[PDB]
UniProtKB/Swiss-Prot annotation:
Name listed for the protein in its UniProt record: Alpha-ketoglutarate-dependent dioxygenase AlkB
Cofactor note text: Binds 1 Fe(2+) ion per subunit.
NCBIfam families cross-referenced by the UniProt entry: alkb, PRK15401.1
InterPro entries in the cross-refs: Alkb (IPR004574), AlkB-like (IPR027450), AlkB-like_sf (IPR037151), Oxoglu/Fe-dep_dioxygenase_dom (IPR005123)
Cofactor: Fe(2+)
Species for this entry: Escherichia coli (strain K12)
Claim: Iron is one of the keywords in the record: yes
Family per similarity comment: Belongs to the alkB family.
General function of this protein: Dioxygenase that repairs alkylated DNA and RNA containing 3-methylcytosine or 1-methyladenine by oxidative demethylation. Has highest activity towards 3-methylcytosine. Has lower activity towards alkylated DNA containing ethenoadenine, and no detectable activity towards 1-methylguanine or 3-methylthymine. Accepts double-stranded and single-stranded substrates. Requires molecular oxygen, alpha-ketoglutarate and iron. Provides extensive resistance to alkylating agents such as MMS and DMS (SN2 agents), but not to MMNG and MNU (SN1 agents).
Length: 201
């Protein structure tokens, strides 16, 4: 395997993509995309929003999952059907039939935007996989191992690609390299990524 515990499903979301993007726009109409500030004080180049019961966000100089969007003071929008159903099909195919995400982080990349190498290890149950769905322009995804200094590997993620990151891979350090400019007929000039998480207890 390229990554222990990971299941790559290329073009799995290709047919669903137009609906998924419509639903991204619907979510963003309620909880807008925003570029969050890191604890180090830097404005992220990736713009974000969330849907589901919980949303990943900065709050009081840390990160956490919150039921309320701090920008609107309202709940994050409910998980769209298209999101829920796509995630469940992917997770089930990959051997995680009980995966029940309560958070979906929606990342938007303009040309040049990047995501610095990091782990997601603050979720209560690290046995639950993350399901990652790529839409629009292609991006180079980098991933290493459980330690920051483990060797990095790189994989192009293209429109409609889904990866279910389970087992050990769930805790790999990962990031996205600066997005190359281009054109995609459904997203125009950007990439979106959905990451479904079980963030609740
Ligand atoms: O493409 C993106 O914007 C994007 C951003 C993320 O933060 C993650 C991913 C993609 C993953 O695919 C992923 C893989 C394995 C474990 C994880 O925690 C993550 C994520 O957190
Ligand atoms: Mn992450």
């Amino acid at each position: 395997p390229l990554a222990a515990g990971a299941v790559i499903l290329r073009r799995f979301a290709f047919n669903a993509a137009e609906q998924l993007i419509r639903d991204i726009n619907d979510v963003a109409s309620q909880s807008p995309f925003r570029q969050m500030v890191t604890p180090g004080g830097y404005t992220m180049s990736v713009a974000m929003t969330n849907c589901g019961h919980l949303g990943w966000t900065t709050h009081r100089q840390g990160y956490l999952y919150s039921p309320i969007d701090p920008q609107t003071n309202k709940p994050w929008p409910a998980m769209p059907q298209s999101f829920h159903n796509l995630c469940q099909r992917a997770a089930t195919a990959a051997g995680y039939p009980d995966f029940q995400p309560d958070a979906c982080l929606i990342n938007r990349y303009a040309p040049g935007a990047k995501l610095s190498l990091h782990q997601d290890k603050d979720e209560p149950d690290l046995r639950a996989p993350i399901v990652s769905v790529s839409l629009g322009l292609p991006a180079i995804f980098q991933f290493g191992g459980l330690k920051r200094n483990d060797p990095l590997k790189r994989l192009l993620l293209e429109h409609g690609d889904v990866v279910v990151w389970g087992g050990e891979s769930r805790l790999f350090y990962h990031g996205i390299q600066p997005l190359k400019a281009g054109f995609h007929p459904l997203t125009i000039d950007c990439r979106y990524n959905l990451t479904f998480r079980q963030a609740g207890k």
